[PDB]
């Protein structure tokens, strides 16, 4: 998955390092690879990565680089 999410341009997308995405995975506006493209649109709103309730609770402000 490290090389997968990375091959789909998530590593530092809108100021969010790969570790944040790999951790988020662990714990029609999009009009629908498909999951990543939609997440990119979701993170662009006023919430950021906090749109994923689990990311705030378990990944936001931890050693996220440990996931990669």
């Amino acid at each position, epitope marked *: 998955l490290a090389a997968a999410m990375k091959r789909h341009g998530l590593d530092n997308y*809108r100021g969010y390092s790969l570790g944040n995405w790999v951790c988020a995975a662990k714990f029609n506006l999009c009009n629908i690879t498909a999951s990543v493209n939609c997440a990119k649109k979701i993170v662009s709103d006023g919430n950021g990565m906090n749109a994923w309730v689990a990311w*705030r609770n378990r990944c936001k402000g931890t050693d996220v680089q440990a996931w990669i």
Partner: antibody
Amino acid sequence: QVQLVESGGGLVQPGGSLRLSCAASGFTVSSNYMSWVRQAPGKGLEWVSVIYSGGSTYYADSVKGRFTISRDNSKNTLYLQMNSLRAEDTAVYYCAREGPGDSIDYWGKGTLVTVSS
Amino acid sequence: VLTQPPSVSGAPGQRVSISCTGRSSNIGAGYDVHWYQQLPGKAPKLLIYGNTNRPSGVPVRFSGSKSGTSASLAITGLQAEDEADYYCQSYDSSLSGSVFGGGTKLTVLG
């Protein structure tokens, strides 16, 4: 060893501007979530703004358009630019470092900002 | 906003729980709740974090719990040294940032 020392507090006139500095040590601000939380005399706590490790910035609706959070990665300093200041903004402004899930982990000693004529 | 009772007046040795009533936008969504203790003339200190965990140095008697749309902080064997202002904190999503409760003035009877 983790120290958060804020400065820049004092008297400002209504509609005036002020900038707060937070000199950090014992850790790096470029690798951490950094926030400002205020407290008006004898009142509750209020989240002002946050700066993410990757540069993302968020603000409370009460300060949006007037305040700006920023940092100096080289100087290891956190800033808060405050414009168009009202008497409502009179508060002790604490520099904060976030732990897990935007919880506050370390607080500064606080700096009091007074808005009056 | 998160809501807490202005007070709570409790007895020494007796257990107490402080309520943090949320909304669908904060606790209802499933965002973890953190608790702070604030002594007079001092800055707040992280007591409980999301929503049960304790940081290094907080006594085992301080506990946290989350019930769907709300949360509570419990103190087993209350001491006079617990007379402080207590705050709950979560993330509001319509507001797009951290949100704090009104605060609770803990009183030790006796």
